[PDB]
Amino acid sequence: GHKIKGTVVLMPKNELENLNAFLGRSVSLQLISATKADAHGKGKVGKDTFLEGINTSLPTLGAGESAFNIHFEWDGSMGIPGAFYIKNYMQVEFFLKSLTLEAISNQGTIRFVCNSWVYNTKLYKSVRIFFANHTYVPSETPAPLVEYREEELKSLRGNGTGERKEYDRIYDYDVYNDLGNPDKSEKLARPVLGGSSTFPYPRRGRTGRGPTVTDPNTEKQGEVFYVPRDENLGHLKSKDALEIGTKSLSQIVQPAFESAFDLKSTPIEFHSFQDVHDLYEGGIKLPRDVISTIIPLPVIKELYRTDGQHILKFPQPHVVQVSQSAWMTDEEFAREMIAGVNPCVIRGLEEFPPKSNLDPAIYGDQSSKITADSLDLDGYTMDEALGSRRLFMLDYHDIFMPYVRQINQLNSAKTYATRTILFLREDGTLKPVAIELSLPHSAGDLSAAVSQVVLPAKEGVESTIWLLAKAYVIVNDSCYHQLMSHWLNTHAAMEPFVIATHRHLSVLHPIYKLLTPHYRNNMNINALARQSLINANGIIETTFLPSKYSVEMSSAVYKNWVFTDQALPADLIKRGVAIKDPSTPHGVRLLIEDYPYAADGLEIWAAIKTWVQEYVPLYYARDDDVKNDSELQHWWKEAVEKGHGDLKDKPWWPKLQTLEDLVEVCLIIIWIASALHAAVNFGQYPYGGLIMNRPTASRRLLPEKGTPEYEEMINNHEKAYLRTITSKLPTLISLSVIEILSTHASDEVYLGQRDNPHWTSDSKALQAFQKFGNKLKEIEEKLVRRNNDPSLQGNRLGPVQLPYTLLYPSSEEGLTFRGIPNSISI
Ligand SMILES: [Mn+2]
């Protein structure tokens, strides 16, 4: 009789860290009709059908994959299959890749893209269901699939209670109340971030471990921070499981390094710049037991060259691959504000002196002490520089001032709230022309140290003071980069959208299909970060200036986060680095014409925009179709009201009642997840792998004349600098982490790629996606030409001779300084 021939592709667990065992009655599939229903309107369900044998005749599966034959009975009463149930009767879970129902014609083949772990059947409340690869808005769902579609969303939402288990697939929200460890020590207590006006914050994925005993508002510790199962990516190669390196670094490598310092087996401090360069030349010699602890660990072992006995050697950072000293030029200091690790904070300055919005009743007179007449603007007057839009600034004054007092009370942290003035030279490069180093002076609670202005100098002790002023600025910048440009604006801001998408858009939904590639690995890296990166006494607190105030500073900045200002053109306009100009291809004119991040970013932005504008009309012809999609409406309402709920009343949220709003929302989400993250992430070790170039912390203020510290500035400027910036032990730990986080796994999926070519059956969507990938390849060719253009050398390469490749769409594996993943995946 008639049978439907199927092929099941799966991966046994050991591949992602005997095939005959899958045969017999080990694995049952049941087809589900999309066209014929039972008396309650639900698609008819076929009989249990088991895997029949191993298929070895297929044209090479992917690594670790095995294919199995199956044949389903399916008479005329059953209609057309559109879904299936699967039950795993084996003890061990397996990774289900796909089901394919073969047909006479390729046209008739029915494909199911699953990519999901299937645990033993007794671990599931309801049987796992998978849908064919057709795409439907809710009003197009075949009637026999409507209830299944909704019941699956209900299953994914859960009920807001219970500890989440490894095999759960439940997506929900919670506040950042899991970072402190008060049951261990009150030193480890941290404010809850989110759920208040004092500390507003994006929500994260609910884990449900339950309260601590000492603080009912803080979540107890656990060995594993849950994510919904299919968010926890398995990898064929352990070296690609980069996210696990943070936990090893904090829990194993960091105590190993600490022991070498405690035992005085290695100098406690760097004593010259050459001691730092040594780290990637001959390496660092450490006790054998420290080497033996570190080098066998997955992911960690890839970070260092070693002899297995005595030496760890870091890779040579890109920033020093051509010149060891160019980082210390004023040219490079300014260039990195437009082409460095954090190229998105500089602003136009349209008046002089710069102003503060902070209350002098709190901090003392907040007037800027920089005088226009003190600046060398290459012969320009201040009025000319302002009128010609040549003045810019890197302004950390108002951001840092409210935290300076409490940071400076910590042992071995001292900072200023800095402001750097930049001039756009006639040659198109930026020139730093003044640094203001500000301290609060509450009249009644100051200390004795004063604010001051430092001007450029090339000789004498004043040149060292200027070099130190640059370090204070870059400590501010490094903190803002890692906590705000990077952690807050990418990792943290995106996770609410991931959760809302799974809770409210079916796998069938076109906008689920559009957005979910841009979420790959994001909940997973974030959960591992809550455990080991941003936790109390974790990697960032123990290596960056603000210590226990680090994450809360990001919540203070989130007060000002605006979703629609994350769009690249809006960001550039808001920061005064571009103006609206409809006579240009991108609709904005850059005020720094050779601004590599912005100029390349606008190309990528435009390509994403075209893709979203082509894809949306395939599913929504009119504004009313957007209004009428109940999944989409619930999705966006929840993303805002719950996911970003502390900002839910802000007037700038798109209402999502039009095609233009749907395009804008999707475009911004994709931009944040792909290009924005890439631009702020993949330069971490390339630029920051030399601690002097990107200091993470400062430990003392400027010395006063007539002290031994001032005499050291005169006699040993390198030691003065090294004593001011991050100490050697936290340097080793922070270099290690940024090396991990700058690495592309070999199984990454980049912008213009998907994890399966059959993600939809809709040929128009597949065609539009192909055009997007082709456009990205054309853009890459254009960006290569920019880097090869000698006219652009000053900003695109600088004296470090490092071509700006962070917005090249494609990359090979490794620490490449290029390539745009689809998602926030590391
Ligand atoms: Mn990242």
UniProtKB/Swiss-Prot annotation:
Pfam families: Lipoxygenase, PLAT
InterPro entries xref list: LipOase, LipOase_C, LipOase_C_sf, LipOase_CS, LipOase_Fe_BS, LipOase_plant, Lipoxy_PLAT/LH2, Lipoxygenase_dom_3
Coiled-coil features, chain-numbered ranges: none
Cofactor binding note: Binds 1 Fe cation per subunit. Iron is tightly bound.
CDD domains for the chain: PLAT_LH2
SUPFAM superfamilies per record: Lipase/lipooxygenase domain (PLAT/LH2 domain), Lipoxigenase
Start and end residues of each stretch annotated as Disordered: 199-221
Cofactor field: Fe cation
Lipoxygenase domain sequence ranges: 135-826
Record annotation: effect of changing L533A: Reduces catalytic efficiency more than 14000-fold
Chief site of localization: cytoplasm
Annotated EC: 1.13.11.12
Phenotype when changing A529S: Little effect on reaction profile
Entry GO terms, CC: cytoplasm
pH dependence of function: Inactive below pH 6.0.
Compartment(s) where it occurs, according to its Swiss-Prot or TrEMBL record: Cytoplasm
SMART domains: LH2
Keywords: Cytoplasm, Dioxygenase, Fatty acid biosynthesis, Fatty acid metabolism, Iron, Lipid biosynthesis, Lipid metabolism, Metal-binding, Oxidoreductase, Oxylipin biosynthesis
Family indicated by similarity: Belongs to the lipoxygenase family.
Quaternary context: Monomer.
Record function comment: Plant lipoxygenase may be involved in a number of diverse aspects of plant physiology including growth and development, pest resistance, and senescence or responses to wounding. At pH above 8.5, only (9Z,11E,13S)-13-hydroperoxyoctadeca-9,11-dienoate is produced, but as the pH decreases, the proportion of (9S)-hydroperoxide increases linearly until at pH 6.0 it represents about 25 % of the products.
Name of the protein described by the UniProt record: Seed linoleate 13S-lipoxygenase-1
Species annotation: Glycine max
Gene: LOX1.1
